[PDB]
Amino acid sequence: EIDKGIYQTSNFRVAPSKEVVRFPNITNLCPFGEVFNATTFPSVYAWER
Amino acid sequence: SSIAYSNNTIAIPTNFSISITTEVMPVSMAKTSVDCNMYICGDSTECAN
Secondary structure, three states: OOOOOOOOOOOOOOOOOOOOOOOOOOOOOOOHHHHHOOOOOOOHHHOOO | OOOOOOOOOOOOOOOOOOOOOOOOOOOOOOOOOOOHHHHHOOOOHHHHO
16 A cells, blocks of 8 residues: 655666676686696695785 | 953054855755665565565
């Protein structure tokens, strides 16, 4: 029940439906398999980067 | 200022002048309005929930 008058309202009219994903033009895959499969790893005191 | 008090003397004006003075009075302030979601959240559905 609303009485006579003028009221401000929040936006219930429109909500987004679609999505717009934009990522850079990169196709190569990171070499996780080769890195995690290396036959030798550094000592903890000589950790690499 | 030097004011001399006398028991038998009175000072009376002999001329007059018209003085126009200004008085500035605020009467109203800007009417502001705020929105719940657009401020607290913006356009995020999860934040609205």
